[PDB]
Symmetry: D2
Subunit: 237 residues, 4 copies
Amino acid sequence: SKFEYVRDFEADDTCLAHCWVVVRLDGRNFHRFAEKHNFAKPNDSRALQLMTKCAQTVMEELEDIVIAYGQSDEYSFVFKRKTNWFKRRASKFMTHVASQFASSYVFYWRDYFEDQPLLYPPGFDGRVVVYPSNQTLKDYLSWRQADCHINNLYNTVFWALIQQSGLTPVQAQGRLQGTLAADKNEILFSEFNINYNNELPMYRKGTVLIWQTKPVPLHCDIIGDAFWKEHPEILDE
Amino acid sequence: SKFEYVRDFEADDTCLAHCWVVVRLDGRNFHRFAEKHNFAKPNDSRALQLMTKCAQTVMEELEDIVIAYGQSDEYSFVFKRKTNWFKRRASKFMTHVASQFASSYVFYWRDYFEDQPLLYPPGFDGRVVVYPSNQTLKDYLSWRQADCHINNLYNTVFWALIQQSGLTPVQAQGRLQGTLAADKNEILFSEFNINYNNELPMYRKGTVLIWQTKPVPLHCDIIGDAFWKEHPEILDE
Amino acid sequence: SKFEYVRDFEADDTCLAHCWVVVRLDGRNFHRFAEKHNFAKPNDSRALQLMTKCAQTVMEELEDIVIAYGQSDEYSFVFKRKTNWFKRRASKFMTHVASQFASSYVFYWRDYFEDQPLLYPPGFDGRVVVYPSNQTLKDYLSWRQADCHINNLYNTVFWALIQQSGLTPVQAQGRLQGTLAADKNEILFSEFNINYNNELPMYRKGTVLIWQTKPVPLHCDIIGDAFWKEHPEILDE
Amino acid sequence: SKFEYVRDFEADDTCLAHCWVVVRLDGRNFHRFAEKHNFAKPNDSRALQLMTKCAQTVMEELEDIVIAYGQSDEYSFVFKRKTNWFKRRASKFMTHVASQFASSYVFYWRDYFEDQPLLYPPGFDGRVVVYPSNQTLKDYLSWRQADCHINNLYNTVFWALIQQSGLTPVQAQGRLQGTLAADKNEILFSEFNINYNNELPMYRKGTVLIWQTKPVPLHCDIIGDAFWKEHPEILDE
Ligand SMILES: Nc1nc2c(ncn2[C@H]2C[C@H](O)[C@@H](COP(=O)(O)OP(=O)(O)OP(=O)(O)O)O2)c(=O)[nH]1
Ligand SMILES: Nc1nc2c(ncn2[C@H]2C[C@H](O)[C@@H](COP(=O)(O)OP(=O)(O)OP(=O)(O)O)O2)c(=O)[nH]1
Ligand SMILES: Nc1nc2c(ncn2[C@H]2C[C@H](O)[C@@H](COP(=O)(O)OP(=O)(O)OP(=O)(O)O)O2)c(=O)[nH]1
Ligand SMILES: Nc1nc2c(ncn2[C@H]2C[C@H](O)[C@@H](COP(=O)(O)OP(=O)(O)OP(=O)(O)O)O2)c(=O)[nH]1
Ligand SMILES: [Mg+2]
Ligand SMILES: [Mg+2]
Ligand SMILES: [Mg+2]
Ligand SMILES: [Mg+2]
Ligand SMILES: [Mg+2]
Ligand SMILES: [Mg+2]
Ligand SMILES: [Mg+2]
Ligand SMILES: [Mg+2]
Ligand SMILES: [Mg+2]
Ligand SMILES: [Mg+2]
Ligand SMILES: [Mg+2]
Ligand SMILES: [Mg+2]
């Protein structure tokens, strides 16, 4: 050797046994990316589906992933809790998911933005997070979907006031400050004749991914017991 | 909130202060990748330069990277020890580097393999490693370059016995087993008239990357004090 | 400051939320300790009760400890899973438990070994371990009690062959090698007229500690659902 | 097994190679302890020497400790950077030091407080901290000694105003608020005829411990190059 001792400094990063491991990817500086690639506000069917695409690439190229959830510039992958893939080394789980996803992005870019030219190669960030119980995991997801629902309902009526109402951003925010759920939902139905509840289920619920085999996308609620009692092969395994 | 508590389970991963942080990327299952994309043995000018390309993308899109080194299906990025980028969160450092690199790969694929068609989107793995001293860091690099030199000298004469000598792999390995440095180096000069020491400096030394501004590639030795006394802006900062 | 920056190098050690934290203490070089303080084989009522003593000291001086279990030169303390004591910093949990226990040992030494003189100050080691589920925690305990039962049944018949049978250690081990449960249990009943099942419940079951208030010691089985259905205030909290 | 799988949940805690490991002990609730055991303000020769005692116990019973430093209710042990004791497992280093120290405390209590009766068994806390360079380590110590010097100079004149000047605490603090170094140092020399610089070197410099063999206590400055150039066997090893 004479130099291989340096390998000793590599610290362990094993994830806690019998726990759900979760890798959450989120595009870097994507606010600036959507700009330069003219993304549709508040939702851009192309983007969401490209992301859902990459997501599947990942769910197929990697392993033990029993579910994924996407929304905005992000995706979460939930590996089977008894996974033994890579000895549960957190560093592996996050870097493979992250790299795979990022190379799949530029790859399938044309399939979704046939007209639009990818200006530069995009960045993504990762992280691993361990959830000890099905409840905590479930809660994690709900935290995400719910985050989605709170952002879409905000952006939908936020951009309708800028575009279809001709208001500068600084205004639309000043006008929506303090509004409740029914508050915004009304500003839509009555101020733009938009019935939120009719919006695409991929904008107000995000995207789910399950095996059916292959990773079939869905836009159903995952916060309610129903979805889970309907799909028990996912958690009790 | 009502669900945001789940965020609390995200464990710290801060890297030890005043230490060199190092991210080392290495292509996944690349043995099978080089196969399907017909890579040249023992070296493939295209591959090495694409890698060196991505590497620069990374050194520009990210920050505080004072040096990089590449070889085979890998690259190491050494961030400035007093870096404060991302509060030294190991998870960030590795996933950005990994994702960026992977998206840049498919992006600039044509520029290097204009003829060859990228068959699928490639995978990369990451990791962070902290080195407490300039000596240990330097040793790390030497470990890499030296690893490079030991593999190239082995593969060069390993493939010359299979290709230009018509030997099955199982043979060439049985014939090289136990050979010393001068042993292989001779099997070349006298059995194929190949003077190893004349081989491309990018095959037997790998690739280095420094600022000159922009990331200029080099193929000089980094194991010898010379290189460092010649470039002190890199370590003593 | 001018020197306080060094405080920054103190790494986080927070234990995973909603998880059972467990500190397990085990006397250092106690084999040599029991020797010099003439401990009774295979059990020494003094030792076990001193340990159970210290254990209570700990359960009172520290907090959120919902249960403890002792045996041989060790004790395990199980903190309430939603504990927030010390922000769940693993380093605190283990060092307080360890120090407290060690000072209580020398303190109450006379109360248990009134005749015997403590020769030197004894050492103890600690560690923290996180268990994600009640099942895993329960399993942990069973692992301990069961370890206890497997050692006591071995030592009881191991020392009866050395003392009451006049056999050198090397022999008694050669004679017990390969024996089953009923094998040793018989070597007792028929070779020394000792009915194992009649042995003190503190030798073959160890010691448990629960609040009743104060930490009341017990010597009942904790591997069987009974104990738990009998004491639900412990886990479901 | 059938239960031993639970052992798998024990996470690694290895300290970074080629780095100074440091265990810092600090008495728990000692403010209340000194009270009940009538400690002398601002310094109590008994306490400081008992602590320095325990400290030596530790430096002898454990290993690779190349130096220690004490002051107030605390002590720091600095293990030799290339130590391999316990595979550098942080959990071991801190719990042994902590337990050993705590049992030695109650043990040698009489030798220092022959008159005073130890009321209850005392608590201590631990932690491990890794320093990458001799400079950072040195700085750590200076941080401690300097902390000592800043507290002793504050307490000395803080208690002289309460005792020898008959002022309630709330006052003495209101009077010392905003004073500089020369400010307090003068309030002494001129208001109580006390020349600080003449105070015991164990009160304004703390305590150091080196091998000479055995752990010989000292009260010299360790912040100045002198001490180190005078003792090079400690760091360059
Ligand atoms: N117009 C448009 N922009 C979108 C859409 N989905 C995501 N984005 C963009 C704008 C959002 O600021 C961004 C996602 O939020 P982030 O918090 O990740 O912001 P950003 O990516 O700048 O931050 P980060 O990369 O995490 O540092 O992606 C979409 O459907 N349409
Ligand atoms: N023909 C050819 N293959 C190359 C060249 N550079 C790298 N490779 C391939 C073959 C090597 O097995 C591989 C790099 O070694 P690795 O140990 O990373 O193997 P592999 O990527 O299969 O493992 P891993 O992905 O780490 O699990 O990349 C090249 O210039 N020419
Ligand atoms: N005679 C006697 N010895 C006992 C009794 N309880 C414990 N011991 C002693 C002998 C055992 O070897 C030791 C506990 O087992 P350990 O595996 O902890 O051994 P030891 O303490 O030497 O190792 P360690 O300190 O963990 O490095 O304590 C007892 O009741 N009677
Ligand atoms: N009278 C007196 N008290 C002392 C002496 N040395 C230490 N102490 C006591 C009073 C100080 O508040 C205490 C050491 O400071 P700490 O910050 O450790 O306070 P305390 O032990 O309450 O906090 P902790 O246990 O860390 O939670 O020990 C001494 O020589 N004389
Ligand atoms: Mg983010
Ligand atoms: Mg983002
Ligand atoms: Mg986002
Ligand atoms: Mg590898
Ligand atoms: Mg590879
Ligand atoms: Mg490789
Ligand atoms: Mg042990
Ligand atoms: Mg032991
Ligand atoms: Mg034991
Ligand atoms: Mg403290
Ligand atoms: Mg204290
Ligand atoms: Mg203190």
